[PDB]
Amino acid sequence: SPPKPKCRCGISGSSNTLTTCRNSRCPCYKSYNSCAGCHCVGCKNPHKEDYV
Ligand SMILES: [Zn+2]
Ligand SMILES: [Zn+2]
Ligand SMILES: [Zn+2]
Numbered sequence: 001s002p003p004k005p006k007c008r009c010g011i012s013g014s015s016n017t018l019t020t021c022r023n024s025r026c027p028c029y030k031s032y033n034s035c036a037g038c039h040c041v042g043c044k045n046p047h048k049e050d051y052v
Contacts, residue, residue, distance in 0.1 A: 005031050010041025021045035 005027035007013065009020045016022075021029055021043040028035050034049045 002033065003031075004028075004036055005033050006038045007035065008039045009043060011039050015042065017042065018044045 007021065007026050007028050009015070009026050013025050014020065014023060020026070021035055021038075021040050022045060024030055026040075026045065027033075028038065028040075029045055029047055032047055034047055035043050035045050036049075
């Protein structure tokens, strides 16, 4: 498994509707990772782990 960044988008950072984890203040998003193990609230992260 790749290095998984963790974020608290919602608890801190920037609470939003869609752009919570989808903005560049989210380390996961920026580093091409899903929010596995995060404390993000209202996480819309388009980086869903590519598992084919
Ligand atoms: Zn986030
Ligand atoms: Zn995250
Ligand atoms: Zn998230």
